[PDB]
Design a protein around this motif. Structure first.
Motif, short mmCIF file in Angstrom:
data_model
loop_
_atom_site.label_atom_id
_atom_site.label_comp_id
_atom_site.label_asym_id
_atom_site.label_seq_id
_atom_site.Cartn_x
_atom_site.Cartn_y
_atom_site.Cartn_z
N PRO A 1 5.93 2.89 8.72
CA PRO A 1 7.02 1.91 8.66
C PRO A 1 7.77 1.80 9.97
O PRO A 1 8.01 2.80 10.64
CB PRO A 1 7.96 2.45 7.56
CG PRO A 1 7.19 3.43 6.82
CD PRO A 1 6.13 3.99 7.78
N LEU B 1 6.36 -2.65 7.10
CA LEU B 1 6.17 -1.49 6.25
C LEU B 1 4.95 -0.66 6.68
O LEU B 1 4.82 0.49 6.29
CB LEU B 1 6.00 -1.93 4.81
CG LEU B 1 7.25 -2.03 3.95
CD1 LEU B 1 8.50 -2.12 4.80
CD2 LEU B 1 7.10 -3.22 3.01
N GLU C 1 -0.36 1.74 6.00
CA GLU C 1 -0.59 2.79 5.02
C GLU C 1 0.13 2.52 3.71
O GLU C 1 -0.43 2.74 2.64
CB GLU C 1 -0.25 4.18 5.58
CG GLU C 1 -1.11 4.55 6.79
CD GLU C 1 -1.09 6.03 7.15
OE1 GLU C 1 -0.05 6.70 6.90
OE2 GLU C 1 -2.12 6.53 7.66
N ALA C 2 1.37 2.05 3.77
CA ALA C 2 2.09 1.75 2.55
C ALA C 2 1.54 0.47 1.86
O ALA C 2 1.49 0.38 0.64
CB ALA C 2 3.59 1.60 2.83
N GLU D 1 -1.56 -0.72 1.96
CA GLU D 1 -2.79 -0.36 1.26
C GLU D 1 -2.47 0.31 -0.07
O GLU D 1 -3.11 0.02 -1.09
CB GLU D 1 -3.67 0.56 2.11
CG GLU D 1 -4.36 -0.15 3.24
CD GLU D 1 -5.05 0.80 4.21
OE1 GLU D 1 -4.61 1.98 4.34
OE2 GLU D 1 -6.03 0.37 4.86
N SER D 2 -1.49 1.19 -0.08
CA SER D 2 -1.10 1.81 -1.33
C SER D 2 -0.63 0.75 -2.36
O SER D 2 -0.99 0.80 -3.55
CB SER D 2 -0.03 2.86 -1.10
OG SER D 2 0.15 3.62 -2.27
N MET D 3 0.15 -0.21 -1.90
CA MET D 3 0.65 -1.21 -2.83
C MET D 3 -0.49 -2.06 -3.41
O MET D 3 -0.45 -2.45 -4.58
CB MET D 3 1.70 -2.10 -2.19
CG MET D 3 2.99 -1.41 -1.80
SD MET D 3 3.99 -2.48 -0.72
CE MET D 3 5.44 -1.45 -0.51
N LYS E 1 -3.76 -0.93 -3.68
CA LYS E 1 -4.53 -0.01 -4.52
C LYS E 1 -3.89 0.17 -5.89
O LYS E 1 -4.57 0.38 -6.90
CB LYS E 1 -4.68 1.35 -3.83
CG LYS E 1 -5.16 2.47 -4.74
CD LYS E 1 -5.11 3.83 -4.02
CE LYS E 1 -5.66 4.98 -4.87
N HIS E 2 -2.57 0.09 -5.94
CA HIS E 2 -1.86 0.34 -7.17
C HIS E 2 -1.31 -0.98 -7.75
O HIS E 2 -0.49 -0.98 -8.66
CB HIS E 2 -0.77 1.38 -6.97
CG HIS E 2 -1.30 2.73 -6.58
ND1 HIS E 2 -2.06 3.50 -7.44
CD2 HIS E 2 -1.20 3.43 -5.43
CE1 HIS E 2 -2.40 4.62 -6.82
NE2 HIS E 2 -1.89 4.60 -5.61
N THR F 1 -0.40 -1.39 -11.53
CA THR F 1 0.70 -0.67 -12.14
C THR F 1 2.03 -1.08 -11.54
O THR F 1 3.03 -0.39 -11.74
CB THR F 1 0.48 0.85 -12.04
OG1 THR F 1 0.17 1.19 -10.69
CG2 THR F 1 -0.67 1.26 -12.96
N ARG F 2 2.04 -2.18 -10.80
CA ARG F 2 3.31 -2.69 -10.26
C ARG F 2 4.08 -3.41 -11.35
O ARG F 2 3.65 -4.47 -11.82
CB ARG F 2 3.06 -3.66 -9.10
CG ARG F 2 4.35 -4.14 -8.41
CD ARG F 2 4.07 -5.29 -7.48
NE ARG F 2 5.26 -5.71 -6.76
CZ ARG F 2 5.56 -5.38 -5.49
NH1 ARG F 2 4.75 -4.61 -4.77
NH2 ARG F 2 6.68 -5.83 -4.95
#
Lengths: 232, 233, 232, 233, 232, 233, 232, 233
Positions: free
Chosen positions: E157, E173, E176-177, E179-181, E183-184, E187-188
């Motif tokens: 970030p 951001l 890395e963050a 990609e996480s958002m 990937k998930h 479940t958001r």
């Protein structure tokens, strides 16, 4: 035994534009809507006209002048001795009533304007007294922050972001700048509000208003005076 | 014998601009609309005039004075002993009524002004009493923040962002500044709201009101009193 | 055979200013407009006056007192035995009705004020109960942030910008300050809303209202009692 | 034989200040305007009174009791056997009606209060149910941000600007803090809106309402019952 | 030759509180003001009552039941053969009309509620479809920012201030963050609007409404049935 | 011979809850108030009924069918040949009218729904056309900022404050990011306003509308048709 | 001696949906409410119908066609020589008046639309002249900031936070970026307001409006023409 | 001898779309509602027509021309010497009136446009006079801040946060920049408000108004003049 007849009504909006507009520069939201304005002009001519007719009767030898709804246009009529005749005379009167009604509307308008002008100047004056109080409060707030600045030993600005400063945050400007603001207290411009500038705006519009013969009109012809064919 | 006539109606908006303004300085949106004001004005003349017609009758030698709707404008009249005499006396009576009602309106306006001014000045001290309570509380939050600043040993300012502080972020000014703000609490100015300045404004304009013989008018002539050419009946 | 006559109407706004104003301090927006107020005063005197006239008839020897629209001014009249006469008596009555109507309006007003005062104090009290709840919620939020602060090992403030702190951001103040805020929980001032201060304001204005004889008026003369020349 | 009269009208605004207030604490802007309240009050007396005139007639030995517009005020009347007797009985009947209608209004008010209080208390638990859903969701966003904070290896706070965070910037608090916020989810307080406090406020004022014999009034005398000097007809 | 008589009027607000309230939980701003509600109840009893009287005439031997304005209270009357008499019977009827009018109002109310409930659930459902679209747009915006992040080589970030992130600022951001958002993504949680929660609120209030015999009332006595002394 | 009567009035608000809702899903604030809806409903029955009275007369052997204000409720009637016969036929005619008008209202509602749905779907594509123009322009500002970022040699982001950028501060994102945003312009999603979602919402609710024999009602009985005990005249 | 009779009324909202909608796309808030629209359609058919009846009388041999309130449905009637008869003819006329009223409404509508379209295009044009002025002012502001930047020797951006830049703060962007903004002045896109996009929106909706035979309707049957049994 | 008839009513909303628009470009919300405009239009024809009926009578050989409410639409009529002759002359008179009133409305509109344009252009220069005062003051605050910046020896910018500065934070730009802003005060552009642009907008639309023979219409035919089949009486 010779009647001449004409039909009149409210003045058109284009013919009254400048008056309506002046009524708006002076009264703003309060100004009458245009239709009520029209209904008020014609209706004022009507009144002066009947009165003239009453004035007309009160003579060594009376003349006969009528006014009454055409049914809402209005109908006027003059009784002559010759054909044209009752015309000319009728015409000569419409014009007269027109003139006395104008002269009076224009004088009222100008009175209106001068009083506005004078009330506006006064509004500006008293608004400055308030704004002046606000500045004075500001200088006091600065005088206090100077104490917090000295005691916290903050001499140079600590704040790296523009924005508003408040009483509790002025000290972050540091004692050196705060002392300068006090030393130059007298030359700190007043901050004036949007309402203050509106007042000025209007005062500028008011001063600009020019009253001329084209400004107001009271009636429009739907039929100009007639030259009667069949006497009585 | 002889009858004089005149026709009369509400005063023009220019004629009462001052009266109108005064009502606004005092009343705000509550002030009356100006056309209502005109109508109220003539009606108050028109009533005083009928009240004059009365007295002129409750007379050793009655006098005939009349008021009635022209056709609203009013057609008014008086019965004289000669032409000029009817003309003169009607004119005098119209000015007598004009005068009476004027002195009533002016006196009633100045009374209104005087009372406004008092209510305003009171509004100010009551408001200052609240402004003072707000300052008092502010002093209280500061004293508390002083405690958090001591316990966290924040002595100097730890913020670089102007933007009024709150009970929870005040300690960030650090304990030296906060100590100072409490020491000079007595000399800290009250913050006043826009409403407080609206009041001050209105009071200054109330004070600046100047009532004269021009401020108010109660009628306008459509037709001045006539010298009739012909005797009656 | 001697009638005395007077003409009355609604009291003027200046004569009622203080009443209207009090009605505004108590009722705020709800207070009646001034014109409705006037129409209500005169109309109340009228009523008490007729009633008096009815009281006047109900006597061993009845007296005659009239009330009726002058056409909207009102006209009253008393019948006397002498010229002045029906006056004095008439005058003596106008004054009477005036007095009974005042005394009653003033007593009502004062009742009004005391109840207001008492409802305002209560508003202040219950509003504090709410504000107290808000503070208590705040202390809880702080108690929670202390847990996030300890666990993230944030002991000193991490935030370099004033502004509001929320439940998710309080921990940035660091455990040392948060512990202090909990330890001093009891002495944390309540934050009061604008509405709370309005209540106070009004309560201050209410307490200030002073009811005197100049406060209300019920009618104004357009013609005081007459001394009649031509008996009946 | 003998007739007593009295004139009667709506109660004064001071006389019903309490009733008025109560309606407001319960109804808000929906409360009635106070002049409507006065009129409703006398009309409810004026009707109960005509209903009394009736019963007094459906009598072995009828009694004559009347109510009618004075000239709106009301002129009321009773036919007695003697002077005092007409005066007394009218007074008694006026107080009998006064009494009846009062006990109806008070009972109906307390019923209103009781029901308000219930609807309010329910409004609160339904609102808490929503506040709870908002907290639940907030917990959900945090758990997600925990994931982004782990995957980006942000363990400690990477922001220096207070200002509530959002689903996308929550990870900036870092994974330690977020882990903590999820561990103590059970003890995290609900955030309530201003509307929720408006409700609590209204309930406290509803509870504080105290109905007594002063709260409501239904009439005022223009003229108390008269002892007529002269017999009838 | 024996008439029994009673006087009825609109139900009081306290007696109707719960109905009015239910009408508010269902209709919100649309609900009728309370006075119109009252005028509608009595007026509905009146109607059922006349009808009963018409039903009463249509018999082998007709009975006589009246309804008409007391002058606006209403007056009803039954003609009996004995004193009490026309009472009982009258009483027996008031109660009857009362009952048929209630049963019907309560059934309507409950129908009302169930339909509301069902329309609310549907509102919630469709509002979620929208909110779901908003989330999907969000994930797309994130997918794009990931491209700007990779290419500008921003993996961690860069932003040191909370606040909202927009399409042009998400890349700050860091990859890395972001990609996480992605990937998930699944479940958001959806973000729901204030209007969404209002819908829920109302649905909770609706489900809570309880219709009982105390819920609605149609009339109140100003005089209960009389036992007549002087037959006809 | 024999006359049957029944009294009839507007449908209850519960009876038309569905119709009411539908009008709202379609019309918003423009929907009619519900009391207006009831009145419109019965009036449409009450007219169709007078139109039936007519046909029944334009008959080889006329039949007498009447509709008129009860005392507004309606008192309706039919002249039979026997008691039951009058009762039966009135009931049949009332249900025949009920039926006709229902099928008109349902057909007219579904037509309304179908058209709404079309206007909505069109509203969406026209809005997307604008959303697209806004994106296009945004792309344009970015291309320009790319120029300022090159000329100032800002390659990487020089800001640490989230908060949408503008034509003049976009270059602060630096030329790498901006280059990327222009390369993938084709895949950048449109931003849609709340109004665009209001539309989508309304379309989903329009689609979810389900018209059945319960949705609409046109009358309620005060009194069902009577079997008169007594013949006529 | 054979009268055929039908009963007509205002068209239903579903049958007028598309017209009402078009009136909304063109007039927005100004468009008539739907009820006034209906009252205006039927009322327009009525007028054309009477006129037809007047046209019908003016013949070598006159035909008799009536129109008058059914009591507010309307009632029309034709007098025939045979049973069906006065029907057919009546039917043939309803259809005629229907047609002349449609053709005219559709032509008016289309005229409406084209003028709207043309006024909208013009609104877009003049709004661009303003927006163009705003950009030009912006470039001037930048030209000035370049002077403050050079003199303060700020060549590279000094501001580490997005947000708006104003005349006094542009220099913080630094001389190198400001020179670029001046050099590329010509290719700086105009910033358009929400009102500008509304204009476009409406212009898109307008262009989309399609006028067909299903668009407007003028009346609905409550009883189609009757075949009379009992001649006269 | 022979009478021609025609029925006539207000112009359609499409027929006056241009007139309507013009009134709006000039008047804003103050413009009349369009149905009021239609009614005003026909009434102005309907009056000019009665004024024609008059002249045609004040004739050596009078002619009979009539206007009256059809059943509001108008039924109009003329008495001819032959069938065609009545038809023709009515048509001519209707077009003569149409023509007269059109030329009045167009002339009155262009007059309105001309005056608007003038009031607008004046509104702009008066506004610029204020914009200039605001700039002047801004220059004044800067000169002062220059003083604080010197006394605190802030030469270069000490802020990193865009966000307009104020009298008290201006010195943070540092004395070099502030010196520059005062040196080039003469070339600093005025800032204009949205109201100033509203005005410019309205003037551009006023100028773009183009009055032609299509802009205004005063009537529509329900029924064109008839050639009566049958002579009179």
């Amino acid at each position: 035994k010779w009647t001449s007849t004409a039909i009149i009504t409210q003045p058109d909006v284009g013919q009254i534009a400048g008056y309506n507009n002046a009524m708006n520069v002076i009264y703003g939201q309060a100004a009458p809507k245009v239709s009520d304005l029209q209904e008020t002009l014609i209706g004022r001519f009507s009144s002066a006209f009947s009165a003239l007719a009453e004035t007309l009767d009160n003579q060594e030898e009376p003349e006969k002048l009528t006014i009454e709804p055409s049914v809402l246009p209005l109908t006027v009529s003059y009784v002559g001795q010759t054909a044209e005749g009752a015309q000319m005379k009728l015409a000569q009167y419409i014009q007269q009533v027109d003139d006395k009604v104008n002269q009076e509307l224009e004088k009222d308008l100008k009175d209106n304007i001068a009083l506005g002008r004078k009330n506006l100047q006064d509004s500006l004056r008293t608004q400055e007294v308030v704004a002046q109080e606000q500045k004075d409060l500001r200088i006091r707030q600065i005088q206090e922050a100077l104490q917090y600045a000295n005691q916290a030993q903050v001499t140079k600005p600590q704040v790296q972001q523009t924005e508003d400063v408040t009483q509790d945050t002025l000290f972050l400007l540091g004692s050196e700048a705060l002392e300068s603001m006090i030393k130059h207290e007298a030359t700190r411009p007043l901050v004036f509000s949007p309402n203050y500038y509106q007042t000025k705006q209007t005062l500028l519009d008011i001063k600009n208003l020019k009253v001329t013969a084209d400004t107001v009109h009271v009636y429009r012809y739907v039929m100009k005076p007639t030259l009667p064919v069949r006497r009585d």
